[model samples]
Target: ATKAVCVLKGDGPVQGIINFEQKESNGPVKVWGSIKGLTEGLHGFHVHEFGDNTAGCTSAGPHFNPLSRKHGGPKDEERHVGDLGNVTADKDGVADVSIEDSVISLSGDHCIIGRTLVVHEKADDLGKGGNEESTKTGNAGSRLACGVIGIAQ
Candidate 1:
């Protein structure tokens, strides 16, 4: 059981309160968050590789794919560790998303408490039908915003 505060600092001043709880199901990590100040559209939300927020959102790197697998849907045959699919911002520029990751752990080697969260500028196609490289990133376009996962308050 841990928590992380995600602050959206960009064209929009989105604010998010993330809660990570350890579950006994196949998915060990349970995450939930509420975000405001978005563009009232879809935003790609995913975990990143590093915890270092030096390069702003770019420092987070690509999705947390320690296994180096091709990026795909949340339920795809193979996916990246940082791939949490997309989070849609409602007409009010707000969205609440919840997901469970079997590889993420709250008290083990794969703990994501110190990782990073990135919000892309475009929506992810989930690698359904897009460019050949789309399967690698769902062609989500530029990195719009980002935040880091830390010890919750």
Candidate 2:
């Protein structure tokens, strides 16, 4: 029902041009993007709580967990709304990311607009890492890049 874009950037060479689209309010959000300068492996991709970049990616706050659920893969029955799991980068360090998420939306009280799209440096363990951080941030490592989610206008 709506569309948005986020231009990811970071201290180093990480960069991405992402698109968010919803065909219907009750349907799913289609997330597509071209992410470059990754580490040739899996990276955690999530929507964080805020759009502010005052403190860099950290200023974006935690994962957008309005429901107060644990971190998990997008397919998990009980998961944070922003837990989108991992995006894999090829040997060329680029990820052609495409995902359809049911929990995040553009038209709702928990709307994702004005939030931030963050890419982590490590693969998200999807809350199965059996560690303290597993259920919190999925053990996803440092932020690699991030951008604010804005309306397409």
Off by over 4 Å in 1: 2-5, 24-27
lDDT of 2 at 99: 95
Model 1 over residues 14-65: C-alpha lDDT tens digits?
6676667764534467778787777777777777878777867777777788
Root-mean-square deviation (CA) per prediction: 2.3, 0.8
Per-residue error (Å), model 1, residue 97:
1.7
Candidate 2 regions exceeding 4 Å error are: none
Give Cα distance to truth, residue 44, candidate 1, Å.
1.2
Residues 73-129 of candidate 2 have per-residue lDDT tens digits of 999998988888999999999999999988899988669999999999999999999
What's the TM-score of every candidate structure? 0.84, 0.97
lDDT of each: 0.72, 0.92
Question: Who wins the TM-score comparison?
Answer: 2
